[PDB]
Design a protein around this ligand. Structure first.
Ligand SMILES: *[C@@H]1O[C@H](CO)[C@@H](O)[C@H](O)[C@H]1NC(C)=O
Ligand SMILES: *[C@@H]1O[C@H](CO)[C@@H](O)[C@H](O)[C@H]1NC(C)=O
Ligand SMILES: [Cl-]
Ligand code: NA
Ligand code: NA
Ligand code: NA
Lengths: 410, 60, 118
């Protein structure tokens, strides 16, 4: 009677609730969950570094200068030492002679070979290196080419070598390197080009072994004449794939694991090949290497445009797994007055040289604890059913029993 | 006017209004279509269920 | 360089790049004395434009990079984002030529002709 009126009107209201709950499930919502995870160990990251100077002056040959002199602003477009040169006496004489191309026959030239040969050598830069009380050596650093040229990665975990671990907070449980940045080997700067800079020091990037460096964009700097402390905190961010989220798991274009940096390097490579018909020497793939003329006229400008101005060519999908390292940096001076002669004598340099070229870098963790920030599925099937059955009880009084009754009755 | 005006609009990257699904949009810098995850925010028409359709309607 | 020209063409035209390569006397960026039709006349003005870029501004139009923006309207193709005289000038050369291509009619019989004609 009126009961049936009230029963179906109540059931209509139950229906609109169940439609709400069901449509909501199909949004595949997610929430973000924060957690501090205590740990007995941490995998030490990879540490990439580059000298800010790309080519050693004493390694540039007559042939190098012929091909790459204009790119490096050592020569004008007439293949001569520019009158706008700003050099000292002795370097000029060396370069003037080196630039004498009268009756010179150019030989084949390649930028990758030039970088590999003229780039700073870890064997000369690395004055000392310790990790967790164990002595390390140039063999512990893997060569990696970047826009800076010939760079070096500690703890790369490539070529079948395992990744290192830390187990306590503090300086004793990390890396300490002493470096000579070798300013007497810096190329004279006579102009402004993408290959030279006004600065002395190194650029460094701390990153997961699963991601390549993008050190020109994402690194931090470290200055000569200081010991620099870098206290780190690991942070792991986890995202959900579709339909919940939009993270990308893998990729099968130049690298194994997917990461933002892998995506950017893929894009940059594609962009140079598309617009210049060549790749810079640090990029992966098969295309021919840009000549120095191509670097100057097409490759440097195109990469600069893409990296600074373009807003559409490359838009990278978020990765499912991101490891970030929060960093707190601080410095003290090296050398003290009291230690300068010791260092000068030990490395056969003057005291002034030591002051302008030596640096120490310490990279360690504040604590083993890492923070995790994770997207979790917010309303799965279980939550959907138990919700619907909980609303059935609210509206009608229906039970799991009530249903199997009227389902057997009909 | 060779391709529809909506081809030049940015798709709604990272915006979630429901399930994320494979989709394709016209990239006006590459001048070709590119995969992305569409989250049902129908802000414009620059999104296609297939690469070929996107390249048909927008590539030119 | 011709990669950016090729892209400007794709930006405004479905006509595959191959059809402009070795068309008539001048296409693309080749030299001659007399253009076979109006399409070939576009390339002539382009070649003349590059020649001007080299001799007056010191550009290397066949090597240098420039940037441009593809817009809804062909005529809205934009060169103003370039940061040097050379990049602006050459971008403009290619823009003029791509638009001119739109006015001209695509013959198929002066594409890859015998050197006899040119
Ligand atoms: C991805 O995240 C899972 C946990 O969600 C973790 O076990 C795995 O190590 C991560 N992958 C990488 C490459 O770090
Ligand atoms: C150190 O001084 C100069 C550095 O080049 C060199 O001539 C000399 O042989 C070196 N001596 C020693 C003992 O290393
Ligand atoms: Cl980029
Ligand atoms: Na809700
Ligand atoms: Na520079
Ligand atoms: Na463009």
């Amino acid at each position: 009677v009126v009961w049936a009126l009230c029963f179906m009107g109540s059931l209509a209201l139950l229906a609109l609730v169940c439609t709400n709950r069901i449509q909501y499930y199909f949004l595949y919502p997610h929430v973000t969950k924060l957690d501090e995870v205590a740990a007995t160990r941490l995998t030490f990251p990879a540490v990439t570094f580059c000298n800010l100077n790309e080519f050693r002056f004493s390694r540039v040959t007559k042939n190098d200068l012929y091909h790459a002199g204009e790119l490096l602003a050592l020569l004008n477009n007439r293949y001569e030492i520019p009158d706008t040169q700003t050099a000292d006496e002795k370097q000029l004489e060396i370069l003037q002679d080196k630039a004498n191309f009268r009756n010179f026959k150019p030989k084949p030239f390649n930028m990758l070979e030039f970088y590999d040969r003229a780039g700073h050598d870890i064997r000369e830069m690395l004055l000392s290196c310790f990790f967790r009380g164990e002595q390390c050596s140039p063999e512990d650093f893997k060569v990696v080419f970047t826009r800076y040229g010939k760079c070096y990665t500690f703890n790369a975990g490539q070529d079948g070598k395992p990744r290192l671990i830390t187990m306590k907070g503090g300086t004793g449980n990390g890396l300490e390197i002493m470096l000579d940045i070798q300013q007497d080997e810096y190329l004279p700067v006579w102009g402004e080009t993408d290959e030279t800079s006004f600065e002395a020091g190194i650029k460094v990037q701390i990153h997961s072994q699963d991601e390549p460096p993008l050190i020109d964009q994402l690194g931090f700097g470290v200055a000569p004449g200081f010991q620099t402390f870098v206290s780190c905190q690991e942070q792991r961010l986890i995202y959900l794939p579709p339909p919940w989220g939009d993270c990308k798991a893998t990729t099968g274009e130049f690298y194994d694991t997917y990461s933002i940096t892998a995506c950017r390097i893929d894009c940059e490579t594609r962009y140079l090949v598309e617009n210049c018909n060549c790749r810079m020497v640090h990029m992966p793939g098969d295309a021919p290497y840009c000549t120095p003329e191509q670097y100057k006229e097409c490759a440097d400008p195109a990469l600069d445009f893409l990296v600074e101005k373009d807003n559409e060519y490359c838009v990278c999908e978020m990765p499912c797994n991101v490891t970030r390292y929060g960093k707190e940096l601080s410095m003290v001076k090296i050398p003290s007055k009291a230690s300068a002669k010791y260092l000068a004598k030990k490395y056969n340099k003057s005291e002034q040289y030591i002051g302008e070229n030596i640096l120490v870098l310490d990279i360690f963790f504040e604590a083993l604890n890492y923070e995790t920030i994770e997207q979790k599925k917010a309303y799965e099937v279980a939550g959907l059913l138990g919700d619907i059955g909980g609303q059935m009880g609210l509206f009608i009084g229906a039970s799991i029993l009530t249903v199997l009754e009227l389902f057997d009755y009909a | 006017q060779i391709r529809p005006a909506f081809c030049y609009e940015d798709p709604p990257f990272f915006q979630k209004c429901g399930a994320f699904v494979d989709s394709y949009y016209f990239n006006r810098s590459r001048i070709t279509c590119v995969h992305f995850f569409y989250g049902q925010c129908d802000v414009n028409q620059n999104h296609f269920t297939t690469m070929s359709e996107c390249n048909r309607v927008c590539h030119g | 360089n011709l990669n950016q020209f090729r892209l400007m063409i794709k930006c405004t035209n479905d006509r595959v790049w191959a059809d402009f390569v070795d068309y008539g006397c001048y296409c693309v960026a080749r030299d001659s004395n007399t253009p076979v039709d109006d399409l070939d006349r576009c390339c002539q003005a382009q070649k003349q434009c590059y020649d001007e870029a080299v001799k007056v501004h010191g550009c290397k139009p066949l090597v240098m990079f420039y940037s441009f923006e593809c817009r809804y309207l062909a005529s809205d193709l934009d060169c103003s984002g370039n940061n040097t005289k050379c990049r602006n000038f050459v971008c403009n050369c290619d823009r003029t030529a791509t638009l001119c291509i739109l006015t001209a009619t695509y013959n198929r019989n002066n594409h890859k002709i015998d050197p006899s004609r040119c």
